[PDB]
Amino acid sequence: SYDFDLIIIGGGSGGLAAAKEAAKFDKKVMVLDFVTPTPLGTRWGLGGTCVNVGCIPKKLMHQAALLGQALKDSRNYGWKLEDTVKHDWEKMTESVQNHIGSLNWGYRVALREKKVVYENAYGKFIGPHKIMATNNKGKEKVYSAERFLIATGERPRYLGIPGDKEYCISSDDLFSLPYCPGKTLVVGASYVALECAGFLAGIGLDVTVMVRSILLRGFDQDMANKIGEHMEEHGIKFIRQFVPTKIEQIEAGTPGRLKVTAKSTNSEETIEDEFNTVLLAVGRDSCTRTIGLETVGVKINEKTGKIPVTDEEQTNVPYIYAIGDILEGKLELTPVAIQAGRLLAQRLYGGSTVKCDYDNVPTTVFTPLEYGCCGLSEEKAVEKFGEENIEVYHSFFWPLEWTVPSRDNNKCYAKVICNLKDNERVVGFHVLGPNAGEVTQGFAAALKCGLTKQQLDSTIGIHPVCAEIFTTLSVTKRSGGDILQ
Amino acid sequence: SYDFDLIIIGGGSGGLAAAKEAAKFDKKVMVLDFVTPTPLGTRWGLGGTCVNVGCIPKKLMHQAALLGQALKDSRNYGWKLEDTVKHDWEKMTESVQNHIGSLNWGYRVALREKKVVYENAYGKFIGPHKIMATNNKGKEKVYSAERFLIATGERPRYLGIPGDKEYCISSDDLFSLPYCPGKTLVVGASYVALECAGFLAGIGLDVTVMVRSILLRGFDQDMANKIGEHMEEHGIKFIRQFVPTKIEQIEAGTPGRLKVTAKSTNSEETIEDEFNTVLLAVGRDSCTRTIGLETVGVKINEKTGKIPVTDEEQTNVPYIYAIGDILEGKLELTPVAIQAGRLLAQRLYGGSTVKCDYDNVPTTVFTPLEYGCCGLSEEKAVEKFGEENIEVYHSFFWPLEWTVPSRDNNKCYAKVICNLKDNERVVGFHVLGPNAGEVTQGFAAALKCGLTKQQLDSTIGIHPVCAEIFTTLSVTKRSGGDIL
Ligand SMILES: Cc1cc2nc3c(=O)[nH]c(=O)nc-3n(C[C@H](O)[C@H](O)[C@H](O)COP(=O)(O)OP(=O)(O)OC[C@H]3O[C@@H](n4cnc5c(N)ncnc54)[C@H](O)[C@@H]3O)c2cc1C
Ligand SMILES: Cc1cc2nc3c(=O)[nH]c(=O)nc-3n(C[C@H](O)[C@H](O)[C@H](O)COP(=O)(O)OP(=O)(O)OC[C@H]3O[C@@H](n4cnc5c(N)ncnc54)[C@H](O)[C@@H]3O)c2cc1C
Ligand SMILES: O=S([O-])[O-]
Ligand SMILES: O=S([O-])[O-]
Ligand SMILES: O=S([O-])[O-]
């Protein structure tokens, strides 16, 4: 018989959630987790991308930037605070790493209490029902299991140019960087790029963002553009329609000096500039190519690296499942991986028939001005239902907290997208402003219940809170009405 | 015919909202607003309780307290900030009044643009379809209208004891107080009492709360008790089951020194202590007794002062309507008054048949730890549906922002209340934590759509944000499971 009921390959958000849930049904479970180091040698503990080099440290550094702004705001509220307050990168990073270390330990303890075997080893299939585990010393051991769950996540992509691995960093290195990045170039335009750029500027750095085409491809573009305009007003420089072709080291150091050469995407024009740090945020690649899928028959999308799965998270191979960021056509989010993992365990071992619902899943981008959304972008809604059947209600708003400091009127923005063919069903929700994620969450539940504009209008606001703007939206884009407060 | 289509008595949240909406239908409208001064002389501009002496300044002073805590938190996030930061009451109050002054102006401008007549005069009915308006010099003018809207709001209550009007203040005076209150006694246990106590402590004052019976009567009591415990851990002192019997002035000043004597509610025990400022937050009374209702036949509840109305906001007198805090059995909230006013204007003049919906209206209490809720308290749900038919799911949580400063784990708290006889319909929602109102608003919209537990569980969380706790609540009170 098999060594385990279930072996899980990857101890991140999805893998750990599935492992804890499967162990409630008295199953024998092993989790394999290993962190291959970045090209410059960075590694970390158990818990995956989110805990170590993703959501958690990112939000903490965003909070540090927010706190910088709160120091300024406090003066008009009467706090007698000295004029210049400087920021200490090492102190910040030490507190972030301390918290991450406690999570690393929490997860190890938790697996032990649930009687899940944890092996700090890299897993690679070698034949049906069999996997090889290789630890940090190169010792190999072979294990078998009745079922397997692939939850290996992704890792940052490089550009394939001279000097990129040698001199640049990615998000994987940023969050434990042992020196202040200094003058920084962020290459890319994903949410990670913009978030990182945002918090680095918010702690006082000179930041530049180099963008291949557009910001936040896949997100509502009018929202994306407002985010960018706000970043630019707060001193972040944008270089539009360029990609780096090489990175050269002018001087080593911590940080050193780097010369970046870059080429226009739509012409032959070339540019050069120098930076202390270059952060590459040009996508992520799925960890699906070096895990012996070919020895067990698992098919993947050879071009993207993603794994297609059934609506129960089964690969083409019936005893092998997959969840999380490696899935094709799903979403790269922690709570999605967590829900997929828990529900999977419940279907396999608890008799449940409930499937993970990947529709209308909310997100938030933690740019200096935060952006929460759920459902369709305006352009997707127009594509799906037709322009004549879509009504968009919108407004600017001004958080009360920002009045006394006297800043940033008419930046925060709210809209809902309604389908006129279906009782003005709210098919998209978008907010730009503080605590955007806190705002969005409950409206995402309301979308699950079929919220219509009429229901939304009958809902009473809470005063004085930003979110209440959603209960009185009466001006449509189609009307051409003015929406400046 | 009449001088006006509609005369509105009271230029506060409800009255202004109704006036702006009625003017969209090309009606001739007047708003009467007058602010009778507090016993110590405080007065203010157009806009009502909320703008001048309620929601707006209260949330701004709450924000000042929050910023104090942010100063502390900033150190662990790497900001090299000096050890002691002091707070300046006058600077805070000056900025708050400056903002209120821009709102006073905004509402006058907005009436004028809508062609609504604004008269700074106190209104008192004198006969059918007729009202007398008295200005600050005592000049009287008579106006008529086809319909009237009463929206006069409420004012703070005193205790009826020696020294109370002479030496104490209320919320009406607090927000423009020209000096720092110093050592403060807050008398009462309403949301106003606790919010004011909370921000005063948050800006560094020595604060004591004197409570007659319980905290936040009318609200979920387990939530109320957690709020109080949190206040107490942060240095707010509570005096339990006492009421003041007199206030005596030891020394005049700004602030002075006051001696408060108080009596136990359930014994003969007596106590004394001294304070710089005494803030009374012991309820509010409806401005319904000095407006000539008897000359037009409008019936009120003589005991409470509140006005019963139909579901269309009509009093017993068919050309006279009422909205806002004075209504019997409704809710004392700005957005409720605003909605009621707008929808009333639309029914009277726009052919709408839509009524204000007073069910599952959310609220937030802006105590140091904020409390948002919507729907039923646990004890009201149990009364209404029966204990065996109620499931409560709950959990503590720890905002990520609080980890690095390393404080206050297992304080923030979330629960939903479900009706097992109706598909686990979520009939109550409760959250204790930061940004509680931002969290509660969308869940209130979900309650309007009939949210069930299954739908809530199928909703995916946003990570890492406090509100996501609501999407994974699996532990019930009934199960006895541990939730730390
Ligand atoms: C900068 C950044 C910010 C983000 N912010 C957010 C956010 O705000 N909110 C949000 O919801 N999501 C966010 N995400 C995404 C979130 O991190 C991922 O959605 C989530 O971690 C994916 O979980 P997972 O289980 O699929 O993979 P991971 O958590 O990446 O776990 C994969 C684990 O498997 C390990 N592994 C890989 N191959 C092997 C092998 N062969 N054997 C053993 N172990 C292996 C990996 O090292 C890792 O430990 C962010 C991501 C990044 C990079
Ligand atoms: C300290 C405090 C905090 C509060 N916080 C909140 C909160 O966070 N959120 C919230 O939603 N609500 C809050 N409220 C309540 C909110 O302020 C009221 O619900 C709301 O203002 C009621 O609006 P209204 O139109 O009923 O009356 P008001 O705005 O009180 O308006 C009544 C107006 O009529 C004037 N007036 C009275 N009699 C006459 C007369 N005879 N003739 C002419 N004018 C007259 C009054 O002076 C006043 O201008 C708070 C209240 C207080 C006291
Ligand atoms: O601005 S120079 O140090 O890269
Ligand atoms: O291979 S999955 O698309 O059935
Ligand atoms: O106003 S009643 O006396 O007709």
Side-chain angles (χ1 to χ4, degrees):
Chain A
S1 61
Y2 303 107
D3 297 315
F4 291 93
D5 293 292
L6 181 69
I7 281 168
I8 294 166
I9 310 168
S13 299
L16 298 177
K20 292 174 204 193
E21 192 77 24
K24 287 183 188 158
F25 302 96
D26 192 27
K27 295 289 151 180
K28 283 181 168 170
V29 184
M30 175 160 77
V31 169
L32 296 173
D33 196 63
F34 195 80
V35 179
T36 59
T38 73
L40 291 175
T42 311
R43 57 211 101 184
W44 48 86
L46 183 64
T49 290
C50 181
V51 164
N52 293 284
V53 295
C55 341
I56 296 306
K58 173 277 291 285
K59 178 93 180 278
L60 291 173
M61 296 193 175
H62 172 58
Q63 174 70 175
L66 289 175
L67 287 164
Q69 179 60 60
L71 298 181
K72 296 164 163 130
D73 290 357
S74 77
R75 281 180 215 156
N76 275 353
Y77 289 88
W79 293 96
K80 290 306 214 100
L81 171 65
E82 176 161 50
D83 208 59
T84 302
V85 185
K86 274 161 173 167
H87 189 254
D88 181 343
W89 173 274
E90 291 185 6
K91 172 71 167 139
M92 176 187 72
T93 295
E94 184 178 350
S95 301
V96 167
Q97 289 297 322
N98 283 359
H99 182 57
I100 289 172
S102 75
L103 294 176
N104 300 146
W105 169 76
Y107 286 119
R108 275 179 284 146
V109 170
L111 294 187
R112 192 186 67 213
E113 291 315 308
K114 285 283 219 303
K115 281 155 210 207
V116 175
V117 176
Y118 169 44
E119 209 44 42
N120 185 207
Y122 190 91
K124 185 187 73 173
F125 286 103
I126 56 167
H129 291 276
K130 285 180 163 156
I131 197 165
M132 182 184 280
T134 304
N135 76 3
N136 203 212
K137 283 142 199 285
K139 304 305 145 179
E140 294 177 335
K141 190 170 162 46
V142 171
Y143 296 102
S144 72
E146 175 156 32
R147 296 187 175 82
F148 288 79
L149 174 60
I150 307 166
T152 53
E154 308 195 294
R155 291 302 284 282
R157 183 183 304 156
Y158 279 80
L159 286 164
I161 65 179
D164 67 3
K165 298 192 175 180
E166 297 83 348
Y167 305 123
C168 302
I169 62 175
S170 76
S171 56
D172 285 354
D173 311 285
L174 176 63
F175 299 119
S176 56
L177 205 65
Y179 53 82
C180 181
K183 190 187 182 208
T184 294
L185 178 71
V186 180
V187 181
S190 58
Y191 73 93
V192 170
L194 296 190
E195 285 173 348
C196 289
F199 72 71
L200 294 170
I203 60 178
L205 308 180
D206 174 346
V207 182
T208 307
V209 183
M210 185 179 294
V211 177
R212 186 185 222 103
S213 59
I214 64 174
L215 307 186
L216 296 178
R217 180 176 298 281
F219 291 87
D220 188 288
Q221 286 294 291
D222 186 52
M223 300 309 282
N225 290 342
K226 281 167 163 57
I227 287 167
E229 288 165 42
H230 176 267
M231 287 168 76
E232 199 179 42
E233 276 178 67
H234 288 93
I236 297 168
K237 290 163 270 26
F238 285 82
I239 293 169
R240 281 165 259 253
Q241 289 86 61
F242 279 87
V243 184
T245 50
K246 60 183 176 175
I247 321 303
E248 298 170 296
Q249 183 168 266
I250 300 164
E251 198 186 13
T254 58
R257 297 162 54 213
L258 306 173
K259 192 181 168 179
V260 177
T261 303
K263 197 176 78 71
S264 162
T265 53
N266 57 48
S267 77
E268 220 52 33
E269 199 202 343
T270 261
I271 61 181
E272 286 162 356
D273 207 348
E274 82 175 45
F275 300 91
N276 287 312
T277 293
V278 180
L279 171 70
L280 299 179
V282 297
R284 296 170 58 79
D285 300 316
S286 286
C287 300
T288 53
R289 318 284 191 161
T290 58
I291 63 179
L293 298 184
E294 78 288 359
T295 63
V296 286
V298 174
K299 289 167 185 177
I300 72 176
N301 183 319
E302 286 300 333
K303 192 176 102 93
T304 65
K306 308 286 203 174
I307 308 191
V309 298
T310 65
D311 298 355
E312 292 170 333
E313 280 92 35
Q314 199 198 265
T315 67
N316 65 301
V317 182
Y319 69 92
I320 299 175
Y321 293 78
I323 62 184
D325 288 358
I326 62 190
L327 298 188
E328 185 169 74
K330 309 289 169 161
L331 299 155
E332 290 105 321
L333 304 164
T334 280
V336 174
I338 286 178
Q339 182 90 328
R342 287 177 183 157
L343 291 179
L344 169 61
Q346 282 175 22
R347 292 190 306 275
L348 288 173
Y349 306 117
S352 173
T353 55
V354 177
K355 288 162 200 54
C356 186
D357 181 352
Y358 292 91
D359 298 334
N360 292 319
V361 167
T363 56
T364 294
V365 175
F366 293 99
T367 34
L369 215 45
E370 299 179 4
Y371 172 41
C373 66
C374 191
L376 302 177
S377 64
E378 185 165 333
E379 51 276 41
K380 268 269 184 269
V382 162
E383 172 180 277
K384 177 173 183 182
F385 295 115
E387 200 225 61
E388 69 285 9
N389 303 312
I390 288 294
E391 200 79 276
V392 181
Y393 292 86
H394 67 161
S395 179
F396 289 101
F397 60 101
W398 193 21
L400 175 65
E401 290 76 14
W402 293 10
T403 58
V404 152
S406 195
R407 65 194 177 74
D408 296 302
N409 192 6
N410 295 318
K411 301 288 168 208
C412 300
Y413 179 77
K415 73 177 168 186
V416 301
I417 298 157
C418 296
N419 183 358
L420 295 166
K421 292 274 91 175
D422 178 27
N423 298 291
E424 282 197 286
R425 190 78 60 197
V426 178
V427 295
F429 173 93
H430 295 85
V431 65
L432 187 68
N435 307 312
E438 309 293 358
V439 175
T440 299
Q441 178 74 84
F443 287 102
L447 264 59
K448 272 279 181 271
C449 307
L451 178 74
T452 64
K453 185 54 163 61
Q454 192 173 348
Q455 290 164 321
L456 178 57
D457 296 346
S458 74
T459 301
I460 304 295
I462 307 176
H463 189 70
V465 135
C466 298
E468 71 178 311
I469 190 69
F470 284 99
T471 61
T472 54
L473 298 170
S474 59
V475 183
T476 65
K477 279 183 170 185
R478 178 169 288 111
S479 75
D482 177 64
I483 53 158
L484 310 183
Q485 294 298 45
Chain B
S1 62
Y2 299 104
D3 301 315
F4 291 91
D5 293 292
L6 180 70
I7 279 170
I8 295 166
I9 311 168
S13 300
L16 299 177
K20 289 175 205 193
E21 192 75 25
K24 287 182 188 158
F25 302 95
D26 203 43
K27 294 289 150 181
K28 213 188 165 172
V29 184
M30 174 162 76
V31 170
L32 298 173
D33 196 64
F34 194 83
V35 178
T36 57
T38 70
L40 290 173
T42 320
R43 67 178 207 78
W44 50 82
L46 184 65
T49 290
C50 178
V51 165
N52 292 284
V53 293
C55 339
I56 296 306
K58 171 277 292 284
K59 179 94 179 281
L60 291 173
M61 296 195 173
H62 173 55
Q63 174 69 357
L66 288 174
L67 286 163
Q69 178 63 53
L71 295 181
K72 293 164 162 131
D73 290 358
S74 78
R75 254 97 67 163
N76 269 354
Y77 287 90
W79 296 98
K80 301 216 244 137
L81 171 65
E82 293 197 321
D83 294 293
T84 301
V85 186
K86 277 159 172 168
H87 189 255
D88 185 335
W89 169 272
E90 288 161 36
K91 170 71 168 138
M92 176 182 73
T93 298
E94 186 179 36
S95 303
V96 167
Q97 291 297 318
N98 285 358
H99 182 58
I100 287 173
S102 74
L103 296 178
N104 303 144
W105 182 80
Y107 284 115
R108 272 198 305 303
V109 172
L111 296 187
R112 207 148 67 176
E113 292 174 336
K114 287 282 219 303
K115 282 155 211 207
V116 176
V117 176
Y118 169 40
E119 208 48 31
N120 188 204
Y122 189 93
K124 185 189 74 174
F125 289 107
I126 55 166
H129 291 279
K130 286 181 162 158
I131 197 163
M132 183 181 280
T134 304
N135 75 3
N136 54 29
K137 280 145 195 287
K139 303 304 146 179
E140 293 173 339
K141 193 169 162 45
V142 173
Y143 296 101
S144 71
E146 176 151 40
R147 297 188 175 79
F148 286 80
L149 175 61
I150 307 165
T152 51
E154 310 195 293
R155 293 298 287 284
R157 183 184 303 156
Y158 281 83
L159 287 163
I161 64 179
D164 69 1
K165 296 194 175 179
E166 296 84 347
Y167 307 125
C168 301
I169 62 174
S170 78
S171 59
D172 280 0
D173 308 285
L174 179 61
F175 296 118
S176 57
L177 205 65
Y179 54 81
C180 178
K183 191 186 182 207
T184 295
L185 177 71
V186 180
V187 182
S190 59
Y191 74 92
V192 170
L194 298 191
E195 286 174 348
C196 289
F199 72 70
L200 294 169
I203 59 178
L205 308 179
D206 171 347
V207 180
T208 307
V209 181
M210 184 178 295
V211 179
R212 186 181 247 97
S213 57
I214 64 173
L215 307 183
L216 296 178
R217 182 177 296 280
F219 289 88
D220 187 287
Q221 284 295 291
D222 185 52
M223 300 309 281
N225 291 340
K226 283 166 163 56
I227 289 167
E229 288 165 42
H230 176 269
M231 287 168 75
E232 200 179 39
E233 277 176 68
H234 289 94
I236 298 167
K237 290 164 267 29
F238 285 84
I239 296 168
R240 282 167 259 252
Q241 289 88 57
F242 280 85
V243 184
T245 52
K246 59 184 176 175
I247 290 82
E248 298 170 299
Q249 182 169 264
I250 298 164
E251 197 186 14
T254 58
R257 296 163 56 214
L258 305 175
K259 191 182 167 179
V260 175
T261 305
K263 199 176 78 71
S264 163
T265 52
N266 58 47
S267 77
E268 215 60 10
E269 199 201 343
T270 261
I271 59 181
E272 284 162 355
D273 207 348
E274 83 176 45
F275 301 93
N276 287 308
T277 293
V278 180
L279 174 68
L280 300 179
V282 296
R284 295 169 57 80
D285 302 312
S286 286
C287 298
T288 51
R289 318 284 192 164
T290 58
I291 64 179
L293 297 183
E294 77 286 5
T295 59
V296 286
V298 174
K299 288 166 186 177
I300 72 175
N301 185 315
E302 287 298 336
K303 192 177 101 92
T304 65
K306 305 287 202 174
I307 306 187
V309 296
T310 68
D311 294 358
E312 290 172 335
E313 280 93 32
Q314 202 196 265
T315 68
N316 62 299
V317 182
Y319 68 95
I320 299 174
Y321 292 79
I323 61 182
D325 291 355
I326 63 191
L327 299 187
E328 185 167 71
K330 311 286 170 162
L331 298 156
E332 288 105 334
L333 304 162
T334 278
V336 174
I338 287 177
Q339 179 93 326
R342 286 180 184 156
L343 293 179
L344 173 59
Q346 284 174 21
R347 294 190 305 281
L348 289 174
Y349 307 119
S352 171
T353 55
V354 179
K355 288 162 200 55
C356 188
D357 183 349
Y358 293 89
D359 297 333
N360 296 317
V361 168
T363 59
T364 297
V365 176
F366 292 98
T367 36
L369 212 47
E370 301 181 2
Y371 172 42
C373 62
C374 190
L376 304 174
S377 63
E378 185 162 334
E379 53 275 41
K380 270 269 185 270
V382 166
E383 173 178 278
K384 177 174 184 181
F385 295 116
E387 198 227 54
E388 69 284 11
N389 303 314
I390 290 293
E391 201 77 277
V392 183
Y393 293 85
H394 68 166
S395 176
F396 284 101
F397 61 99
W398 195 20
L400 176 65
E401 290 78 12
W402 295 8
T403 55
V404 152
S406 195
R407 65 194 176 77
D408 295 301
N409 191 11
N410 295 321
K411 300 288 166 207
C412 297
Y413 177 76
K415 74 177 167 185
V416 299
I417 297 157
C418 296
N419 182 1
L420 295 166
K421 292 274 92 174
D422 179 26
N423 297 292
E424 283 196 287
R425 191 82 56 199
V426 177
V427 295
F429 174 95
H430 296 90
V431 65
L432 187 69
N435 308 304
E438 309 294 357
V439 171
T440 296
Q441 178 74 84
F443 285 98
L447 263 59
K448 271 281 181 270
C449 306
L451 181 73
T452 65
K453 187 54 163 60
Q454 189 173 336
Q455 291 166 316
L456 177 57
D457 294 350
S458 74
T459 302
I460 303 296
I462 306 175
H463 189 68
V465 135
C466 295
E468 70 179 312
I469 190 68
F470 282 99
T471 63
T472 54
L473 296 170
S474 56
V475 183
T476 64
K477 280 184 167 184
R478 181 168 285 108
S479 73
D482 178 64
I483 52 157
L484 311 164

